[PDB]
Write a protein that binds this ligand. Sequence first.
Ligand SMILES: NC(=O)c1ccc[n+]([C@@H]2O[C@H](COP(=O)([O-])OP(=O)(O)OC[C@H]3O[C@@H](n4cnc5c(N)ncnc54)[C@H](OP(=O)(O)O)[C@@H]3O)[C@@H](O)[C@H]2O)c1
Ligand SMILES: NC(=O)c1ccc[n+]([C@@H]2O[C@H](COP(=O)([O-])OP(=O)(O)OC[C@H]3O[C@@H](n4cnc5c(N)ncnc54)[C@H](OP(=O)(O)O)[C@@H]3O)[C@@H](O)[C@H]2O)c1
Ligand SMILES: NC(=O)c1ccc[n+]([C@@H]2O[C@H](COP(=O)([O-])OP(=O)(O)OC[C@H]3O[C@@H](n4cnc5c(N)ncnc54)[C@H](OP(=O)(O)O)[C@@H]3O)[C@@H](O)[C@H]2O)c1
Ligand SMILES: NC(=O)c1ccc[n+]([C@@H]2O[C@H](COP(=O)([O-])OP(=O)(O)OC[C@H]3O[C@@H](n4cnc5c(N)ncnc54)[C@H](OP(=O)(O)O)[C@@H]3O)[C@@H](O)[C@H]2O)c1
Ligand SMILES: Oc1cc(F)ccc1Oc1ccccc1
Ligand SMILES: Oc1cc(F)ccc1Oc1ccccc1
Ligand SMILES: Oc1cc(F)ccc1Oc1ccccc1
Ligand SMILES: Oc1cc(F)ccc1Oc1ccccc1
Ligand SMILES: N[C@@H](CCC(=O)O)C(=O)O
Ligand SMILES: N[C@@H](CCC(=O)O)C(=O)O
Lengths: 254, 254, 255, 255
Amino acid sequence: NLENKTYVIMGIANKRSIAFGVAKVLDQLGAKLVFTYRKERSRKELEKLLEQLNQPEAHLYQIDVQSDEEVINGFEQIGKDVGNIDGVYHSIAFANMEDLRGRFSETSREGFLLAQDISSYSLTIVAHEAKKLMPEGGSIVATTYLGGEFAVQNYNVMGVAKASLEANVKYLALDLGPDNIRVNAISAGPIRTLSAKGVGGFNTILKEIEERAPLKRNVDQVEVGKTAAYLLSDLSSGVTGENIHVDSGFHAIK
Amino acid sequence: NLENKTYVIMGIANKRSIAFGVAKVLDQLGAKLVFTYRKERSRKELEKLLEQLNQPEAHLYQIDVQSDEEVINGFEQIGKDVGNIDGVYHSIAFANMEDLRGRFSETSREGFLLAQDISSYSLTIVAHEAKKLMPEGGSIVATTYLGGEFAVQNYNVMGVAKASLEANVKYLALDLGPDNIRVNAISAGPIRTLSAKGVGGFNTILKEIEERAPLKRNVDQVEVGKTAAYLLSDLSSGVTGENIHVDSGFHAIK
Amino acid sequence: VNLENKTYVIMGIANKRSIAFGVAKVLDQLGAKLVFTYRKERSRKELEKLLEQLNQPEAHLYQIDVQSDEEVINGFEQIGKDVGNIDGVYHSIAFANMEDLRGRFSETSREGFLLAQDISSYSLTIVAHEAKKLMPEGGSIVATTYLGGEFAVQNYNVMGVAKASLEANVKYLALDLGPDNIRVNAISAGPIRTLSAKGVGGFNTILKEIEERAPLKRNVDQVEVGKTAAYLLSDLSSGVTGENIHVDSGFHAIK
Amino acid sequence: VNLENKTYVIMGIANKRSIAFGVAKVLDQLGAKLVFTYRKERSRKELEKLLEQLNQPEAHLYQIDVQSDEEVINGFEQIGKDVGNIDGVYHSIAFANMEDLRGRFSETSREGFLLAQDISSYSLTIVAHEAKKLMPEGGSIVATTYLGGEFAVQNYNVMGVAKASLEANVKYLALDLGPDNIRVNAISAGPIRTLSAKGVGGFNTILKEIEERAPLKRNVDQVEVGKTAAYLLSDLSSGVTGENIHVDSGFHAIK
Ligand SMILES: NC(=O)c1ccc[n+]([C@@H]2O[C@H](COP(=O)([O-])OP(=O)(O)OC[C@H]3O[C@@H](n4cnc5c(N)ncnc54)[C@H](OP(=O)(O)O)[C@@H]3O)[C@@H](O)[C@H]2O)c1
Ligand SMILES: NC(=O)c1ccc[n+]([C@@H]2O[C@H](COP(=O)([O-])OP(=O)(O)OC[C@H]3O[C@@H](n4cnc5c(N)ncnc54)[C@H](OP(=O)(O)O)[C@@H]3O)[C@@H](O)[C@H]2O)c1
Ligand SMILES: NC(=O)c1ccc[n+]([C@@H]2O[C@H](COP(=O)([O-])OP(=O)(O)OC[C@H]3O[C@@H](n4cnc5c(N)ncnc54)[C@H](OP(=O)(O)O)[C@@H]3O)[C@@H](O)[C@H]2O)c1
Ligand SMILES: NC(=O)c1ccc[n+]([C@@H]2O[C@H](COP(=O)([O-])OP(=O)(O)OC[C@H]3O[C@@H](n4cnc5c(N)ncnc54)[C@H](OP(=O)(O)O)[C@@H]3O)[C@@H](O)[C@H]2O)c1
Ligand SMILES: Oc1cc(F)ccc1Oc1ccccc1
Ligand SMILES: Oc1cc(F)ccc1Oc1ccccc1
Ligand SMILES: Oc1cc(F)ccc1Oc1ccccc1
Ligand SMILES: Oc1cc(F)ccc1Oc1ccccc1
Ligand SMILES: N[C@@H](CCC(=O)O)C(=O)O
Ligand SMILES: N[C@@H](CCC(=O)O)C(=O)O
């Protein structure tokens, strides 16, 4: 039960977004929500999606996490508008299509660093900026994937970025733990989203999970959301630095 | 909310048993509970404990996990008395105290096997027998410790048995996955319990955690129960074969 | 890597395809003195004829069933008299009932479970405690494990919990015996066509998945495990203890 | 071992305590031809004076700042022209601002973060791409990591995250280049008095924690690191790829 709580949800682009899964769950549970977006087309979508939710207000903020200024200023506004918050759901990554296929060894410098910036470094600065609105502590949750732990065909430059995000989560837990701020990851199973369209072999991935993972089935966004609710609430009070897989057991098998 | 759910909690010895921390969390949440004990000492401890809970009736069954017949007959009686269950919290381990100090290279065959039998195998037989009471799926959660993943001075025979338990969970997850039964482990930070009096240098454990772990404080049994509630419920659908550390982040630092 | 003046006990050759026979060809070729332990009379017969191919002056053959404290304590004691002090042990022993090696892991008997723990895991602890007696100036112990000790792999069932237990054992033995200058490590071998492999449901499927999916797109052999053993049993690995080296075409790094 | 007729590229010697200098004396001793790459004019000077301690008939030195694609591309193309095909590459290169090292991790700057990724992680990818051109029948690439890549350690901050990245790079490089017969691995070294260690808060208490807690209850040296390098860079390690072999007294194995 999340009444009185306020969460910032980062990275809804549309109805299939993992973060929109997160949103429905927290909304259903009683939370007040604030959404951040990058593209104009995403603000429009959010505008249309908020009619499903039970939020009396729409608290929408443009933040491109490639700019320090937009993060600093975006969180500063949030505080002025809604006050102190209880956590942040981070659902943000990017890579060029070029570097999500063929050969990892040909990734460009610029393409490599672009994925680190957006998909890993972004959590450090969000956490720093968010920390200023959690003086009594809170919870930060970032979205990860199996390709950060094992080399998987195609995910290429994103795997190295996911590996980097998961360590980020561990150094942030260590740093922020004395401020009563917990930092964890959800490692979601594969899911049909707009960003998945740039992961080569996606369909085959989806299928190899039905056939082989313990639950013999794929997970959806609402499942990411129910775990996110546990992480973002006091249910998970002893838990930090952790990486929960929501993937039907796939992580546990070979 | 766990109303009209039913869970079998295994291994409460006294007010301090981790498992009693599980029991309060689920009782609060509206679940019907059923308890199993090994020895009278606890039958009587349990009498008095359950007046602190809101269980309108006390369902208590004596099971020693060294006996197939008692594991088998116990669960059959549970079902005739209570119908189908939603899950099982397993909170049982044992070693001989000589094998919890000194040199691991000295462990006897009897002592080694005693710890595997009780602390590991028992989850297999329990899972086989509870499956019979979970025709529509359910959740099973065992209690493990960081000594299963790393060598820690003194824990010795228990560390190898805990590593064996944690694989036990992965192999049960894969097996029962297709029956909609999920199997996970909670990895609890150090807690002053009865069994914990048997481990060598347990005091220095507690303090090493306060000083060094990200949250810079110790966990308690209620913190286990809360996470156990997450695991035993629909919030963790899509999560199986997993091991959630509830240990102030200590698993994640070196 | 030069192995003259060095003596290693190899535990678990049964025939020419044994993984331990790979270890043996490498060690011998590097000039170490070898001492062999077997359980079944048939294994020794097989060792006797395999020895012809090695460059060993004499057979050092000892019957040790690791299920017996006496056989372990007396064999090591008897080895350390025939040859004196030693340098390392290659451990290569495991067993599970075939019933417990296919179908449903939730159906495993207590008996078959403890059987697998006893033979395939406990034996490491007691062998090291006896082997230590013969390594006053230090040494090196290596056991043999499988990816199934680290993930739930189909069919492998009771043995994967046994390997899980093997792995922690190696780590705990490393912590225990480090001050004594004794290292303890594991090789995690990819699937190899052997006698014990016959008991593992789905084996041909396993090998084929490696060829199709592991980074080297091929299967490894006994000699390849052998080569890494030499590393681990010798002073190139000084510094390395409690390690688990995967010799598997890189299969462990992918999903 | 036997590295006569092999040629390796060693990147990252700065002085006589460079970890890569460990690597070099072992390779040299094992009979390899060696080619060394450097960034700062001063390191080239130190190398020329370190080459005297080695059995190297010819000094092959190449200026390579891994921040520059054209510098890696041209240095490798040049190496190929002066020695022919090579057998492997020891990579031993990392960098981060003290500014970003001795802080609260959450206060790390963007440019600081990406500088560490660029130098310490991305450069393996490009080295590997250029080095492949000189390994038409295969080879071996080794990079140098640190336990701080697997858990959050005090003070390591920006570098542990770069190391986490380095450790994914190796796995992805391994999977991508396996078919070409190129193995790719890391050594996770324990701590060691080096020029670069001077950037790391609390280094003294880190050396002393290993001493009091790692199963060997002592610290390792460059030379130990080198001996595992030899194994990884040679055919001893043929089944092995995408591995992280820890040369740290067993510290990784404990809590
Ligand atoms: N779907 C899966 O199979 C899967 C599995 C495991 C983990 N994940 C992770 O889950 C997260 C969410 O992705 P998704 O699958 O839900 O896809 P998605 O709907 O396409 O969401 C990705 C989000 O990232 C945002 N984003 C990208 N660059 C940004 C920037 N520079 N500044 C601010 N926002 C930026 C996008 O915003 P704009 O559209 O406005 O640019 C978009 O809302 C990702 O980190 C992904 O790696 C996904
Ligand atoms: N406390 C910690 O720091 C810590 C940390 C991580 C994990 N754990 C785990 O938590 C679990 C419970 O331990 P605890 O700390 O709560 O101590 P506890 O209060 O002593 O509970 C241990 C329980 O094990 C039961 N038991 C032992 N052998 C049994 C058998 N053969 N058949 C049936 N029951 C048996 C005991 O019953 P009887 O009293 O009737 O003999 C007792 O109820 C254990 O699995 C332990 O490994 C503990
Ligand atoms: N084959 C693989 O793909 C694979 C992969 C990874 C790891 N491994 C491991 O490799 C190791 C060696 O097996 P392998 O494949 O080489 O098969 P193997 O040739 O069948 O060897 C197994 C050995 O175990 C011995 N053994 C079993 N119980 C014993 C006991 N109680 N006392 C003494 N010796 C006993 C057998 O001796 P007797 O015949 O004399 O009874 C036999 O020599 C095992 O640990 C296995 O788990 C195998
Ligand atoms: N020492 C340890 O405890 C420890 C532990 C684990 C792993 N490692 C790793 O071991 C490797 C070597 O470090 P070390 O401890 O031996 O220290 P070191 O001797 O100071 O070496 C650092 C090397 O990196 C080079 N380098 C930095 N930036 C470069 C660039 N942009 N282009 C080309 N070369 C560059 C330096 O060359 P220049 O001087 O020319 O700039 C120097 O040769 C590193 O990857 C380090 O992270 C060290
Ligand atoms: O991280 C992802 C994992 C996945 F399986 C499908 C989509 C995912 O998101 C992105 C993939 C590549 C680039 C950006 C996001
Ligand atoms: O497993 C335990 C771990 C721990 F840290 C404290 C108590 C725990 O319980 C037991 C310890 C030894 C034997 C049986 C139970
Ligand atoms: O551990 C094994 C792994 C493998 F793939 C093939 C054979 C293996 O050995 C045994 C399997 C079962 C029982 C004893 C040894
Ligand atoms: O990675 C290092 C680990 C260590 F323990 C000591 C030195 C290390 O090298 C560095 C190189 C550049 C910046 C930071 C550390
Ligand atoms: N014989 C095993 C499978 C072994 C194989 O086909 O490789 C079974 O019961 O199907
Ligand atoms: N003096 C170190 C930290 C203390 C230590 O050496 O342990 C520094 O440069 O901050």
